[PDB]
Amino acid sequence: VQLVESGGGLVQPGGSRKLSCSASGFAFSSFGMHWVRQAPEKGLEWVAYISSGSGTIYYADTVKGRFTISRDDPKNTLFLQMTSLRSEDTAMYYCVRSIYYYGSSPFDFWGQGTTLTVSSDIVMTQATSSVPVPGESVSISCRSSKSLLHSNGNTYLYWFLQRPGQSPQLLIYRMSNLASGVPDRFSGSGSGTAFTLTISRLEAEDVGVYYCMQHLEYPLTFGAGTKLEL
Amino acid sequence: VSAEDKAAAERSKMIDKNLREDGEKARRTLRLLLLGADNSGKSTIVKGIFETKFQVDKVNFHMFDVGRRKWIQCFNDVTAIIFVVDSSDYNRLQEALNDFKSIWNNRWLRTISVILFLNKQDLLAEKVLAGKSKIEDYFPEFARYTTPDPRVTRAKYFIRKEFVDISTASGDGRHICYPHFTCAVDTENARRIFNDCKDIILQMNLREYNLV
Amino acid sequence: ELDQLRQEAEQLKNQIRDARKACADATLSQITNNIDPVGRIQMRTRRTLRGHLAKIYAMHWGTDSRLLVSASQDGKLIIWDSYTTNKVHAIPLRSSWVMTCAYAPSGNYVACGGLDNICSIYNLKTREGNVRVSRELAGHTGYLSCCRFLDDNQIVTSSGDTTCALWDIETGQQTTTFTGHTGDVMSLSLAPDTRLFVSGACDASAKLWDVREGMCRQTFTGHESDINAICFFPNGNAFATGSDDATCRLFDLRADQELMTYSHDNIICGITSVSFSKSGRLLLAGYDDFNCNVWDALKADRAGVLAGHDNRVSCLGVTDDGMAVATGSWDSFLKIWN
Amino acid sequence: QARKLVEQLKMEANIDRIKVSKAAADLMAYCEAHAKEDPLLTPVPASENPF
Amino acid sequence: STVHTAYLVLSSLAMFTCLCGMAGNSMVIWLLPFCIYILNLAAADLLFLFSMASTLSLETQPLVNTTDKVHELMKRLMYFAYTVGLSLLTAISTQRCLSVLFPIWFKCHRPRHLSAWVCGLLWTLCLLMNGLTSSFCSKFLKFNEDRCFRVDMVQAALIMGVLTPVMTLSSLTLFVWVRRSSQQWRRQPTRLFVVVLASVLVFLICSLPLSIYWFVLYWLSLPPEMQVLCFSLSRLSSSVSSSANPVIYFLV
Ligand SMILES: COc1ccc(C2(C(=O)N3CCC(Nc4nc5ccccc5c(=O)[nH]4)CC3)CC2)cc1
Q1: Domain that residue D5 falls in
Q2: Residue A150 is part of which domain span?
Q3: Looking at the UniProt record for this protein, which Gene Ontology cellular component terms does it annotate, in alphabetical order (chain D)?
Q4: Are C315 and D16 in contact (CB under 8 A)?
Q5: How many domains are contained in chain E?
Q6: How would you label D17-32 residue by residue, b for 16+ Cβ within 10 Å and e otherwise?
Q7: Angle at B186 between CA B180 and CA B191, to 5 degrees
Q8: Which residues of chain D are within 8 Å of residue C320 when distances are taken between CB atoms?
Q9: What domain range includes position B101?
Q10: Minimal C-alpha gap between A29 and chain B (Å)
């Protein structure tokens, strides 16, 4: 599976760029695809969502009106047409695949992004910004403004790892379920408005910045991030 | 409903659309079952399952033969059954009559018509003309049969009469039998199926309106 | 000669009949006489699931009692979310002549088969977001009538070649072949412990097999005609069989003969599906006359009727938690009753 | 051809059998023990029913 | 005088037949391709029969301003439902004709919702035409002599020059084709012949006389002692039509 994002570079404010993510290795037409950006030294922010079949498109309140997302299913490309580019749009633009059915694992593959340099809402609060901790067990907490537990019994918390110089990786979906390929050392628990991701036997190649997301309702809001440094 | 639930609903709607499209495509074709024990020439009428596709007058046809008392329930919705019989052999003709009687009186084929192909009539012509073998030795009631070469006609009409008398006895009019006489070098064997199928579909259409 | 062997067979059959009768002292209808009848059960269609465009032939519940898979002659498997009517997958089959449908206990695989004489195992939880064929199991001579997963690597299939098989999916080979049935094996029920499985064939007999040994432990013979459905009692020490005789029969494995027959003169149609309740007290049976009947398994009394289909009920399953019954018919619809 | 049949019949003639009364009582005891955990027999309240 | 006796007699008969037909049509609606047409014709027949019966019952009294306005509205709904039912009968006849003449097309390449599309189109066109005529011709509304005549003749041309010939021709064509094609299969479907002739005779003898009356009033000066009789007989005949449509179309 491979999502290779293109575009990117320097644009004066007021310009316009089109980012393209080329999908290879998987059935692109069956996947709803997200654009998630990250400021130069800050956290993750959600931009736009296009569903399979292009039926439903959602935009963030920061980029509504001046951003446009489209997909070209035969050519396996996802597009983001950016207009009226501002100085707050300088970021790395990640492309994320998501499929939604009973038991799915959305936000499971993140493409290596492209850098653009232009010169109500649930508030996820991961207060612990940096904790020092190998071979031990450490826990990370995320708090939500409202309860993420839907009446359908599903509580929508997602945990991500962004290792240095690498696209973020899904660890837990719906605060209990481990993603495929994620070692069983991680686990997640909690109730509405209070969550935790405990990792037992912390190892090398398993330290980075951990994020929490709500998929309870749009716009999707990430957490500030918790950095684990040895 | 949650965002995940809404997206699941959208996936379900797309699955419904694709299902409906494929179902319409399947509706544009007609499904036939090819039956016949052996030494009958099933493989050479239209010159686990072997499927033969053909079309006549821009109407798609789709024929299956296997290679029956239990899997015949699967074909309760086919347009017609194509029972092929070797009319040249008389040792195996009563077996063919019992086989046809089993098919006709099956509780699942109570609405399925049969296109009957009394095959290999050139070999029948040779056998009747040469006179080495006699029907009366196998069917006693043939010495007392007169048609309603003359003798070869009497033979073939008699055989078709046995099959149509099996058909007529217990049909009750919900399905009929179309007997055709065929050789192994005949090309007009898809038009026969097509005409019989138009009549079958006319019956089904006139039966959706509770008229026939 | 052959006459001596046939005479020994007749003597042994009479010895079996003598042993079975020496163990028969009180009928189940006679020990169960003094317990309270369950009364009428009122089950109503809670979900009806549109989407199939041909006759539904088989369905299997998942272990979670929420996802189920249905096979139809339109050549598509559909996995349903029963709590929401949604369709999770739509698997297009290479052969539209499908007669069996198995959902693996883990949930990663589904299986189907039919007149193609092949069992196809399908990979649900892959990357790439599509369901692709994992393994095409060939080797049966006749059509596949049933298949049940033992684990993610073992599946037991019954065929119309008068034979059952035990398959290793990774190697794709017949690990154990079960012979002994004269007629087409139509059904198959795995024991709760998965060490034994029972078979029903067109020879009007049922046979109890050992998966580990490949041997027929017992043969249960009381039906006047072919057996279309079969199912263990949840205890695992009994099973029920449905026939074209318009009758269900309950057979014990330890007493080694029939216990109770479920028939009424008002119904003259064959039985196409059989399943049990969680406690085993109810016996859900589907019929050719387009409605299912619930039987007090211990009293041979009709406790209810499930009449909602306008064609014959071809399949019937009860959830592992016993919440719902799902019935599919030839009218392209299947329904969930609670 | 027939030696297989007589061998199977011999393997089936020598099997331990319990009386029908014991089997019936065992099935009845199973049905009585789990009668409280069987939704289709004694319906659960509307809150519990997911359909 | 004498003629009022016939007026009362036929009014009572029309009311009774309209009650029976309203009950039957409601039953047809409750019990529910061809099904869409049957349900739509049942709904239009219910509207027409209710309007007709309660218009008679309203006529049982002298004219009152609100009462006369309700009389007018129900008269317009009556004529509107009449036109819809006639168009739908023509649609059913054409459908049967296509299923006979083009069997494989009907089974394979016919759009699944063509019945819905055609029924909606019939309702819409009938509403447009009937409402236009109601606007141009009513006494409690925007009456206009020349334009009302134009719209009346337009609707007359529609009915008696498309919808009647099409039904008669489709039924006769189905008759002749099934007769041609039944000379081989021995069941010899006399039921089909009976149903076709019954449907066409009911149409031409029970439904059409109302259009015939509205043609005759314009183009043949009639004395009053026969005009009320003509209209009330056409009333009874159309009631018989809208009450016999269920037993003729649904029950068989
Ligand atoms: C043969 O031509 C047909 C044309 C139309 C129909 C129908 C119709 O919708 N009508 C007739 C009744 C009414 N016409 C009418 N004319 C008047 C003339 C002078 C003064 C007042 C009036 C008035 O108040 N009304 C409305 C239109 C379908 C029944 C039937 C046959």
Answers
A1: 1-51
A2: 124-227
A3: extracellular exosome; heterotrimeric G-protein complex; membrane; plasma membrane; synapse
A4: no
A5: 1
A6: beebbbbbebbbebbe
A7: 60
A8: none
A9: 3-209
A10: 11
